[PDB]
From a paper:
Rhomboid intramembrane proteases are evolutionarily conserved proteins with numerous important biological functions, including growth factor secretion, regulation of mitochondrial dynamics, and membrane protein quality control (Fleig et al., 2012).
To gain insight into these preferences and their possible interactions, we have generated tetra- and pentapeptidyl chloromethylketones (CMK or cmk henceforth) harboring amino acids preferred in positions P5 to P1 by the [name] rhomboid [name] ([name] henceforth), using the sequence background of the Providencia TatA (Stevenson et al., 2007), represented by the parent compound Ac-IATA-cmk. To provide mechanistic explanation for the observed increase in inhibitory potency, we determined the structures of [name] in complex with Ac-RVRHA-cmk and Ac-[name]-cmk. The side chain of Arg in the P5 position of Ac-RVRHA-cmk could not be modeled due to poor electron density, and the two structures are otherwise virtually identical; superposition of all corresponding Cα atoms yields a root-mean-square deviation of 0.19 Å per atom (using the SSM method as implemented in CCP4MG v2.10.4; Krissinel and Henrick, 2004, Mitchell et al., 1990). The interactions of the residues in the P4, P3, and P2 positions with the enzyme are structurally independent, explaining why the effects of substitutions in these positions are additive.
Author numbering:
A (entry chain A): 91 to 270
B (entry chain B): 2 to 5
């Protein structure tokens, strides 16, 4: 076994975008992929999602893709590709919405999606062991530490706190729905 | 820029 097609294509997409950001510069890529930052861009539908594909540091991309590979891969394997797609689209969209509302359109990263997956896998395992999916103990601890670090700004980088919490919320909400 |  190994990462399914959705898991894989997201990782590829993130790496391609990250390479473009090194070659072209972060600003140039943000012009194309960021959440609409002018009313002229409001119909460029991709922008409501493609903010999730941009990363600004090595630490940021590595840890997000690590979590995505593990939790995304697990969701895809056990619950199917379709489920992972829907979690991803909902969390990207809502996390982006909340972030721009609090802090404006200049943000990016897969962590809204990652927080959704953390909450989803944990709550689904908790409420519905039958599902086969759960977040084992050690990972609960490491997810908590990761969350706490963003919240209290312990990576010396400016954090997208709205994206992070909206993400988590979405994941928990979808687990709750699915566990009924 | 804010990091998600």
């Amino acid at each position: 076994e190994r990462a399914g097609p959705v898991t894989w294509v997201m990782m590829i997409a993130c790496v391609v975008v990250f390479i473009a950001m090194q070659i072209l510069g972060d600003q140039e890529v943000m012009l194309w992929l960021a959440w609409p930052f002018d009313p002229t861009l409001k119909f460029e539908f991709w922008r409501y999602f493609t903010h999730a594909l941009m990363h600004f540091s090595l630490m940021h991309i590595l840890f997000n893709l690590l979590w995505w590979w593990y939790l995304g891969g697990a969701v895809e394997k056990r619950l199917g590709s379709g489920k992972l797609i829907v979690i991803t689209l909902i969390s990207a969209l809502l996390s982006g919405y909340v972030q721009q509302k609090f802090s404006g359109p200049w943000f990016g990263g897969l962590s809204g999606v990652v927080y959704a997956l953390m909450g989803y896998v944990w709550l689904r395992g908790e409420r519905d062991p039958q599902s086969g999916i759960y977040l084992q103990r050690g990972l609960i601890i490491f997810a908590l530490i990761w969350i706490v670090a963003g919240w209290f700004d312990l990576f010396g980088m400016s954090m997208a706190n709205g994206a992070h919490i909206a993400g988590l919320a979405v994941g928990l909400a979808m687990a709750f729905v699915d566990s009924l | 820029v804010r990091h998600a």
